[PDB]
Amino acid sequence: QYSNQNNFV
């Protein structure tokens, strides 16, 4: 299982 989230402001 591979769960990824990224935020760029």
List the resolution, Å.
1.0
Provide the token pair at 2: 């591979």
Residues 9, 4: Cα–Cα separation, whole Å? 17
Q: How many Cα atoms within 13 Å fall on the side-chain side of residue 1?
A: 1
Experimental method: electron diffraction
Under 8 Å CB-to-CB from 9, ≥6 apart: which residues? none
Terminal-residue alpha carbon distance, the chain? 27
Residue 7 structure tokens: 């935020």
DSSP letter string over the chain?
A: ---------
